[model samples]
Target: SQPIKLLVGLADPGPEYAKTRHNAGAWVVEELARIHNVTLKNEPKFFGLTGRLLINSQELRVLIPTTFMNLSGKAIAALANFYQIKPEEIMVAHDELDLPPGVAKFKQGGGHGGHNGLKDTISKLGNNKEFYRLRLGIGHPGHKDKVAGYVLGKAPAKEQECLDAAVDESVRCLEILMKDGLTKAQNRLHTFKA
Candidate 1:
């Protein structure tokens, strides 16, 4: 079997998106870069910034989709096809409102759960949901109307502290997933609390 490489899909560009709930995946990627000193360069063709990291002595490509959140799968499909990666080998990192903030969850294959980005990804990837998911919890909105604003909005001051800690934890979890595989990493981290 070939090695598993992660194909992360981030929401958007600019620092304004930094603290927004929608950009959690990108923030986690940034944390990875910060800890590992990996440089992600803008690769226009892939529609994202990307870099290679040597984790567990194996080369892994880290990506932050430059395309707006909903169109992420277009570039992801391109990269997957170019690299000959099977859907099962791809691991997507994104935010989840079902789970509470300050927590991270790992899973493989399921419903899109109303995430437009994941919906587009599943569509472009030919409806394959068997791929891995590194879901970062952002918690749900207090009301239906708040859903849109909540995801695009920055965290509150109290939540910001939690977000920072979660970012660090998410980065470590990503590294574990890269080095140890999902089940192993999950076993080691499922009980983790902040």
Candidate 2:
């Protein structure tokens, strides 16, 4: 198996989308960078904000696409292709509607589950759904008609707190993911509580 090399966050660019539920993945990546004291800079070459961190003598690339959520694959594919990162070595974090806020899960290759970000990623990766996923819960709006508004809107204060806690926990377990492997990281994160 390839070592985990890249961590991608599905985020829409612009100040207006900064705090929206749709940018939850961006929040996670940003927080991870902060925790490592690594500054991310806009790199047009990678089509995103890119940062690098070394953990256990291994380099981990962190990315938050400058493109909108639906077209995030452009940035990811550009970076992966340039770096020769295989699909299995990439991990994506994105908001999940099925799970309520405060919950997060890690899983291996799977369907996109209607997530435009993941959908685009799968398509961009030549339909190879072998990457890992970090599912960050943002809760659902109940009706499909309200999904667009719900994800594009700001999360409630309480819900935001939950999401923050989950991100913190995940960041803490990142080293395990990089050093010990995905299953160990999943165990550490899954058993965590905010």
Candidate 3:
């Protein structure tokens, strides 16, 4: 029952990608910060915006990487190294193309399906893939070559609705994760549908 010290939401920086499906992961940190009223401030050392808050006596640091998705590890490694947080004590939230929108999943790190954020993070964390991952389903583009455009495209109203709900669920699960433990959080999040 390892307690998570860091919650990272991966996304490309700038307003251009703000509403894109690729930024779905960033929504997790945004929602958690909004709900808790933890104002995020840009921290160059962390390579992102950051806020710190405690839940049930557990210290939790939230980060929204500005290094862009592919270079995500740069930000994460910087923070983790400074704090001495292990690869086992971090959770990365990012969009999942394999699952349809409205589905969110929690996982112990393993196969990442070639997610750029996960790939870079693993490499930057010294090839350790032991952290947790919160996969926010964004639905696939249905064509391999069109993925970039599809992910960068703004989500429709319906998909946005689902994504919003998924982010909320992921936040709540984090609370349970820090309070009750990982197994409980996994069980609760595993039941999430839409």
lDDT of 2 by residue, 72-105 (tens): 8989999999999989899999998988788888
For candidate 1, the lDDT comes to 0.78
Clashing pairs in 2: none
TM per prediction: 0.92, 0.95, 0.96
Per-residue alpha-carbon lDDT of model 1 for 1-194, expressed as tens digits? 23467658577677778668888888877778767888888988888888778876667777888898889998788878887877888778888888877777778899878888888889999988888777877888889777978899987887767666777776786677777766777776567655
By TM-score: ranked, best first = 3, 2, 1
Decide which is better by TM-score, 1 or 3.
Answer: 3
lDDT of 3 by residue, 79-154 (tens): 9999999998899999999988888888877976878889999999999999988999999887898888888898
Give the Cα lDDT of each candidate: 0.78, 0.87, 0.89
C-alpha displacement of 153 in model 2, angstroms? 1.1
Alpha-carbon deviation at 32 in model 2, angstroms: 1.0
TM-score, structure 2 vs. true: 0.95
Q: Which residue segments of model 3 deviate by more than 4 Å?
A: none
